[PDB]
From a paper:
Loading of [name]-I molecules with peptide by the catalytic chaperone tapasin in the peptide loading complex plays a critical role in antigen presentation and immune recognition. Tapasin, a key component of the PLC, is a 48 kDa transmembrane glycoprotein that bridges the TAP transporter and [name]-I to facilitate peptide loading. Mechanistic insight has been hampered by the lack of detailed structural information concerning tapasin–[name]-I. We present here crystal structures of human tapasin complexed with the [name]-I molecule HLA-B*44:05, and with each of two anti-tapasin antibodies. Movements of the membrane proximal Ig-like domains of tapasin, HLA-B*44:05, and β2-microglobulin accompany the transition to a peptide-receptive state. Together this ensemble of crystal structures provides insights into a distinct mechanism of tapasin-mediated peptide exchange.
To obtain additional mechanistic insight into the contribution of tapasin structure to function, we solved complexes of tapasin bound to Fab fragments of two well-characterized anti-tapasin monoclonal antibodies, PaSta144 and PaSta220. Consistent with prior immunoprecipitation data, PaSta1 and [name] clearly bind to distinct sites on tapasin when evaluated with purified proteins by SPR. Both antibodies bind tapasin with KD of 1 to 2 nM.
Numbering used by the authors:
A (entry chain H): 1 to 216
B (entry chain L): 1 to 217
Write the structure that this text describes.
Amino acid sequence: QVQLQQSGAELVRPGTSVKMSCKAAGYTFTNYWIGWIKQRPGHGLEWIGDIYPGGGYTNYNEKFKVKATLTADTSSVTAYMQLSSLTSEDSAIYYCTREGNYGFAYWGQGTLVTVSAAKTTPPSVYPLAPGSAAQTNSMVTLGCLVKGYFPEPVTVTWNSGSLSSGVHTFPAVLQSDLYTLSSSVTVPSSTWPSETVTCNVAHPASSTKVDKKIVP
Amino acid sequence: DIVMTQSPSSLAMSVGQKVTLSCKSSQSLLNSINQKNYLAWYQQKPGQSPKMLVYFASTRESGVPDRFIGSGSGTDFTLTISSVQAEDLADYFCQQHYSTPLTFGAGTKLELKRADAAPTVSIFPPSSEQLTSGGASVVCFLNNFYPKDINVKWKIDGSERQNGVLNSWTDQDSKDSTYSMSSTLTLTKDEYERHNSYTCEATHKTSTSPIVKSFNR
């Protein structure tokens, strides 16, 4: 069966270039067009261009003629897209597709590209207690604020993952060219502060782990 | 060149009954010869690759159930799902395959209908270690509300500003189908010690009076 396998995620810096792959296995590779689609958060889907690995090769979008050159290797099945002059607005997920008469119908796994000049920095985590002056009614909600890290996600758990009920983690938000998020957990007042509650955060990029208890 | 306007933004209907999606084209997509509307409907599950549902604006793709009915002509096109199931939760795009460059629609997102639930608001003052190393950031949480439509407003004992207000909305829960949201007030330790009351208000359909949580420094 046909299948499109794309290269891994590319975390790079602004101004530089990036080339990704798209291996086409399961059909006559040099007989179909290969289209490239961009999906950026907030701008839907966009078509960059197609390439025919035969004679007449490429056909580009208007806004993607200087950037995102296309090349193919008819010998070893692969399709390449060469991005250039990378700016922050080029962070998106890029798919390769096998174009047809009525559409694509055959997509690749996808390659996530992220561009930023932020140096890889470990996060700093701060407990979030409700405060002594409060009206804690039955359930008490605690937080773990994670600020100033780059890149990738941070894996946050509560009591090494033993406490997962009522846990809400929020998507990361870029701030001052550094990521930031927070997590919330609701526990009964009969348990806290009677029992300790800790958030464990792991930054696989910087390879750090921080466990900080929530104290009143 | 060709603009694809999808409607509506995002509908959340219960399972069992039929839903409909519309797609308007800025120009006719119907070829005079071989009279076929070059428009295709795709479906993309949450956090995945899009899968084509309907092509040539009427015919289904092999492997798609017959509940996905595509119709329309010229500039107005429609995709209906006769009996919505859990396996239909995704976002759907209409794409014209007639002119270059090829263009998509913004996409309509499908959610699950529910009953109204007020948010659980809880504010948090800055930590001790945050002040000794850095500034001061207030945290506000809004947990498990339906629908997603919500707005947050801060206030600093009379004053108010949007500077240093970074928010974060979650997606619909894959269990209770609720929405959550956080809000931060990133300041410095300097201008934090000259104010007393810090509050975090909301505005939800459940209560005519907002949910207010404040604290004195």
